[PDB]
Amino acid sequence: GLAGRGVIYIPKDCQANRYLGTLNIRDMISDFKGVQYEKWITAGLVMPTFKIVIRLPANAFTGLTWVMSFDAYNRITSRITASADPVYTLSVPHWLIHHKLGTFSCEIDYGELCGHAMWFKSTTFESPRLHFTCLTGNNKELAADWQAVVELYAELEEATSFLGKPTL
Amino acid sequence: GLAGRGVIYIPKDCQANRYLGTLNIRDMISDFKGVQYEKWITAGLVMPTFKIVIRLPANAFTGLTWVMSFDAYNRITSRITASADPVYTLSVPHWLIHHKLGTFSCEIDYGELCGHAMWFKSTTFESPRLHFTCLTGNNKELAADWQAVVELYAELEEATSFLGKPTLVFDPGVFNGKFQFLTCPPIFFDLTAVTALRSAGLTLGQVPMVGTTKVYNLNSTLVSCVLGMGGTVRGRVHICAPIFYSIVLWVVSEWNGTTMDWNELFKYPGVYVEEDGSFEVKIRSPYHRTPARLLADQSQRDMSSLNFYAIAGPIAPSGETAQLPIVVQIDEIVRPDLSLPSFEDDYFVWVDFSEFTLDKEEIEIGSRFFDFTSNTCRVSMGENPFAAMIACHGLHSGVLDLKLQWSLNTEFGKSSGSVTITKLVGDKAMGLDGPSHVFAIQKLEGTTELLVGNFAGANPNTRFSLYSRWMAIKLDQAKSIKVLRVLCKPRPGFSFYGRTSFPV
Amino acid sequence: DLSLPSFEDDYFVWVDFSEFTLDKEEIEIGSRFFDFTSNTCRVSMGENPFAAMIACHGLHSGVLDLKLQWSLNTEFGKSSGSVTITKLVGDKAMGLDGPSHVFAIQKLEGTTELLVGNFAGANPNTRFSLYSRWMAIKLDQAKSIKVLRVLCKPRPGFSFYGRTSFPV
Amino acid sequence: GLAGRGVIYIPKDCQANRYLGTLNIRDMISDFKGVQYEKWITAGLVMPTFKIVIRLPANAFTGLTWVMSFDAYNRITSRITASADPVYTLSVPHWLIHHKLGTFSCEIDYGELCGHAMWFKSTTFESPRLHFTCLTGNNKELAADWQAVVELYAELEEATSFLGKPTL
């Protein structure tokens, strides 16, 4: 079920390479707080399979494409908050979000994309982030500022091991 | 085949609530004149099944939505010709016409929606109209004025009876939970807002208003037959805007205001709406039901509401300015949790007469159930579902059992005279004498039956002159009476024809 | 080894009104079975198992058949007016008209039914505001009445919820 | 699972008729907050079957007996907060807790003992309380003040009706 949520603010003039924001995955779940958050406290460690949903009004008249970057180890954050070069945002696991397709969804198997289980009380190594950036801009500015909603769905259960299976 | 036709003229700037025009159904057929019109003359009476087609260039770049209102009894015409409030246009059988879908078509079974057969030579009760109004306006004006074509298709054959089959038969203990023609007026979202809330009340028995005018309609009347309801609202949402506008809605039910915490919001059981489609939302309440009507000083938001949260959008290209309209239709309460019926199979007040100024008072009833007036005494009319059902149909027919009760103004020992019920067939001047009854005033109560109907088989909700039984109440010592109360209880099978509305 | 039941399936006293000081007296019942008060007449409440059962539950619901009886204070030949039962759905201000009933005072008795309940389905043993049927007894010549007695007899299925107690 | 909890404070000299405290059932669940509390928010209405557990060191050398009174309609609260007469505490559904038996447990079928379903956001009629009182005192005072833990276990699921089945 819904485990956490957050909001990304889109300026009326969303140009290529605009940083839109960063959501902190653990904060989304703890600020929500949360049937899943509460199951997590009891489990201690979780290795979730998240379904991420970005709710987003479909529109074919803008040309907007965004990138969601999964930055589990906080490697690109510092370098994209002023301006997000696609070389950075595309250098970690990521998904293209096309405006024409509207509401977007993907699976993040935290076991694979991340590798280590999450501890209810505090971050272990670094804090896992989702970055939202604009890859291709709108053909002309839109009528007004707007927002998109980011949602995390999961059925959190107790993790049996600290470590995932090796990506490589 | 084609039986009649007409034209609706659309202004280049078609704004919400613009009245576009009224077509008179019988005139469409007679001005055409017409293989069908000619078959009609021979038949005398017809109970058509019409296919109505509105020819209309499909266009996804305007956001225009129109309403065609079937007004068989001419109930809303006078009130929409300057400006058409959706409360009126949606209060009778109606159809949404979306510009993106282009040419529109529907069936009107005149037997059901109307109730009485049409006479080739002249209108019988009132003249059946089709109204065309704009429900949601164009995002920006179009290039030029234009027109749409309305067409009637039918294979007219001779009608065997004057009366259709009754749309509704009076029963207090029966409100199913399925609705027809329950459309909420448009809800609007500004694009200058990053998020927003629009509430729709679920106190469905509440009578809708336009300024100071009450618009009685069948749906609110039906709901008033119940104390309250819970369950799941099944409906449809229509997003009435150009392809280049879009929005994402979180639709959920809340009780007594709304939470201010976005996180709580999404812990409730709602549904997401991105585009035209159906929806099911559980009615949310501490009592699991929301009341059918409001008491004094209460607001519809104090109870259960259907809330529409804009969580992403609406968005549009620059420089659009129009709001994004959402039109909600409610089809039924599924898996309903109903309260008790508000009324039992029992009597209810029709009218109280009091404050008599003359000893001789004679109240003509005839064969009608209706609102009385008097210059010589005070009339207090009862308000209840039955009376509204009468007001919300074109025709009705049945039998009322009456109970009369009265109390004295003067000392009992000094009392004399009677409450006399005159029962004739015909009229006062040439009528035959039926079961007239003299109740000596000391009885202080009496009973009688009233036929609501006539030789044709049904009454309109207006004055009319059709041979029937005829009743009157005669008082000879009225100043001795403090109050005369008349209650009625419809006999099984009391019938209504042609759902419509009644503005006052 | 039980005795006879103390009560039969019969009416019992709910309330006696007497010693009326004003000709106009209007007693609001609404949808409740409860203890009346008045500044303008004397109220004498009945005490019996039914009333205690109402007092010893959190919620109750059902239908009461009512019998009203009265006797005159003034000479019969001089009497006028009525005991009127107002029956609405809603409230006095915006209510729909039900089976209201005008009992000429010379009838000296009348009957009616009272729904004890509301749209939610049950009443607490306190004041509350929940849409329901609504009843009142209207007197226009109360000073002519020596006593107005209201008896009630619960229809089968009168229900109680949540056993509790009631200190006074 | 555990749905809420609270604490009762026992004085070293626990005499007959000492009022020990009142736990508010809905507060226990909302202060805990709570996998069950969060399921409740989603359900709106719950008709729980609670298992109540009072954790309590078994002791055969005191003679202490307490009463837990289920006061769903807040009928005795006002009259027991200074001193709790057993006539009040035993006048609503209640359980005897004997010190010799230690940790105590019972079931409260909220459908029966209460009658109406609970609304996540606020109290409907009155707020359901558990009262803790001393029925028989300690033979002599104990060594020091102490405490007992009260716990609510339930698997909250959505209530289909407002009303239970009638107790009577």
Author numbering:
A (entry chain T), D (entry chain E): 1 to 168
B (entry chain A): 1 to 504
C (entry chain E): 337 to 504
Can you quote the paper on this entry?
differs from its parent strain (GFLV-F13) by a single Gly297Asp mutation. position 297 is replaced by Asp. deficiency of GFLV-TD by X. index. transmission was correlated with a lack of virus retention by X. index, although virus acquisition by nematodes was not affected. solvation shell via the addition of 60 negative charges in GFLV-TD. with respect to that of wild-type GFLV-F13. feeding apparatus, thereby reducing its transmissibility. ligand-binding pocket was correlated to a defect in virus transmission.
The CP folds into three jelly-roll β sandwiches. The structural variability of CP subunits within a capsid was very low.
